[PDB]
């Protein structure tokens, strides 16, 4: 009826964050975003290293949410030593796509953020 659990797409199964994500109930069900925290609130997982290799993945992700969801949080995970170029483009695109840019220096930061975000359900 309502998101009591985070719905994660199975394609992101095997990531360290899900491996230790446990504070909040979550399950796989394949959704348009990466982690859906609510029917109108979604979080995206974008590895900066992955964007660094494939920039188009995140753009299409945002295009899809553009109509589907209201509140869209983009969680970026830093993996490279010089992530500033990607962060610039990610931040700016967030302006254009109206998504909250969240930065994570590890899967830990990502996990704690997801868990605490859905535990509260408080907009950022």
Short mmCIF file of C-alpha atoms in Angstrom, two decimals:
data_model
loop_
_atom_site.label_atom_id
_atom_site.label_comp_id
_atom_site.label_asym_id
_atom_site.label_seq_id
_atom_site.Cartn_x
_atom_site.Cartn_y
_atom_site.Cartn_z
CA UNK A 1 0.00 0.00 0.00
CA UNK A 2 2.77 2.34 0.97
CA UNK A 3 6.52 2.04 0.91
CA UNK A 4 7.37 0.59 4.31
CA UNK A 5 10.41 -0.98 2.78
CA UNK A 6 12.90 0.41 0.28
CA UNK A 7 12.36 -1.22 -3.05
CA UNK A 8 15.62 -1.92 -4.75
CA UNK A 9 16.13 -3.06 -8.28
CA UNK A 10 17.83 -6.60 -8.40
CA UNK A 11 20.35 -5.21 -10.84
CA UNK A 12 21.99 -3.38 -7.94
CA UNK A 13 22.15 -6.57 -5.86
CA UNK A 14 25.68 -7.37 -4.85
CA UNK A 15 26.72 -3.87 -4.02
CA UNK A 16 28.47 -3.33 -0.59
CA UNK A 17 25.89 -0.85 0.52
CA UNK A 18 23.05 -3.40 0.30
CA UNK A 19 25.33 -5.94 1.91
CA UNK A 20 25.33 -3.93 5.14
CA UNK A 21 22.02 -2.07 4.69
CA UNK A 22 19.79 -3.38 7.41
CA UNK A 23 18.39 -0.55 9.52
CA UNK A 24 15.50 -0.07 7.25
CA UNK A 25 13.54 -2.90 5.62
CA UNK A 26 14.22 -3.23 1.93
CA UNK A 27 13.50 -5.70 -0.82
CA UNK A 28 13.97 -6.16 -4.52
CA UNK A 29 11.16 -5.56 -6.95
CA UNK A 30 12.77 -3.73 -9.92
CA UNK A 31 11.85 -0.13 -10.00
CA UNK A 32 12.63 2.77 -12.32
CA UNK A 33 15.01 4.41 -9.70
CA UNK A 34 17.70 2.63 -7.73
CA UNK A 35 16.17 2.84 -4.32
CA UNK A 36 12.62 3.90 -3.95
CA UNK A 37 11.88 5.27 -0.49
CA UNK A 38 8.36 6.24 -1.26
CA UNK A 39 5.87 6.22 -4.10
CA UNK A 40 6.81 9.81 -4.95
CA UNK A 41 10.29 9.83 -3.41
CA UNK A 42 13.19 8.04 -5.04
CA UNK A 43 16.95 7.83 -4.65
CA UNK A 44 19.40 7.08 -7.39
CA UNK A 45 22.68 5.44 -7.03
CA UNK A 46 25.36 6.65 -9.23
CA UNK A 47 28.90 5.63 -8.83
CA UNK A 48 31.11 8.40 -9.95
CA UNK A 49 33.58 5.87 -11.33
CA UNK A 50 30.72 4.32 -13.26
CA UNK A 51 29.61 7.76 -14.60
CA UNK A 52 33.23 8.36 -15.40
CA UNK A 53 33.05 5.27 -17.65
CA UNK A 54 29.35 5.65 -18.73
CA UNK A 55 27.89 9.19 -18.31
CA UNK A 56 24.69 8.43 -20.25
CA UNK A 57 23.43 5.92 -17.60
CA UNK A 58 22.59 8.64 -15.13
CA UNK A 59 21.09 11.01 -17.71
CA UNK A 60 18.56 8.45 -18.91
CA UNK A 61 17.89 7.53 -15.29
CA UNK A 62 16.98 11.18 -14.56
CA UNK A 63 14.88 11.49 -17.77
CA UNK A 64 12.81 8.54 -16.64
CA UNK A 65 12.19 10.01 -13.16
CA UNK A 66 11.34 13.32 -14.76
CA UNK A 67 7.77 12.28 -15.17
CA UNK A 68 7.53 9.24 -12.89
CA UNK A 69 8.56 10.70 -9.56
CA UNK A 70 8.29 13.90 -7.67
CA UNK A 71 11.15 13.97 -5.22
CA UNK A 72 14.30 12.62 -6.72
CA UNK A 73 17.53 12.30 -4.69
CA UNK A 74 20.75 11.52 -6.50
CA UNK A 75 23.29 9.74 -4.41
CA UNK A 76 26.74 9.80 -5.91
CA UNK A 77 29.50 7.57 -4.73
CA UNK A 78 33.04 8.77 -5.04
CA UNK A 79 35.66 6.25 -6.15
CA UNK A 80 38.28 8.32 -7.98
CA UNK A 81 40.99 10.54 -6.56
CA UNK A 82 39.99 13.51 -8.71
CA UNK A 83 36.19 13.38 -8.80
CA UNK A 84 35.77 17.15 -9.12
CA UNK A 85 35.05 17.14 -12.85
CA UNK A 86 32.31 14.59 -12.55
CA UNK A 87 30.92 16.30 -9.45
CA UNK A 88 30.68 19.55 -11.35
CA UNK A 89 28.63 17.95 -14.12
CA UNK A 90 26.59 15.90 -11.69
CA UNK A 91 25.78 18.97 -9.57
CA UNK A 92 24.81 21.06 -12.53
CA UNK A 93 22.65 18.44 -14.10
CA UNK A 94 20.94 18.13 -10.72
CA UNK A 95 20.01 21.80 -11.10
CA UNK A 96 18.47 21.10 -14.51
CA UNK A 97 16.77 17.81 -13.57
CA UNK A 98 15.69 19.05 -10.13
CA UNK A 99 17.29 16.37 -8.12
CA UNK A 100 19.04 16.63 -4.83
CA UNK A 101 22.73 15.87 -5.15
CA UNK A 102 24.09 13.82 -2.29
CA UNK A 103 27.72 12.96 -2.09
CA UNK A 104 29.11 9.78 -0.57
CA UNK A 105 32.73 8.96 0.04
CA UNK A 106 31.97 5.29 0.50
CA UNK A 107 29.17 2.65 0.30
CA UNK A 108 28.97 3.28 4.05
CA UNK A 109 28.00 6.95 3.59
CA UNK A 110 25.53 5.82 0.98
CA UNK A 111 24.02 3.15 3.22
CA UNK A 112 23.74 5.32 6.30
CA UNK A 113 22.11 8.02 4.22
CA UNK A 114 19.56 5.66 2.66
CA UNK A 115 18.72 4.08 5.96
CA UNK A 116 18.43 7.34 7.85
CA UNK A 117 16.49 8.96 5.00
CA UNK A 118 13.79 6.28 4.85
CA UNK A 119 13.75 5.83 8.66
CA UNK A 120 12.74 9.46 8.96
CA UNK A 121 11.04 9.94 5.53
CA UNK A 122 12.11 13.51 5.90
CA UNK A 123 12.83 15.39 2.68
CA UNK A 124 16.44 16.55 2.42
#
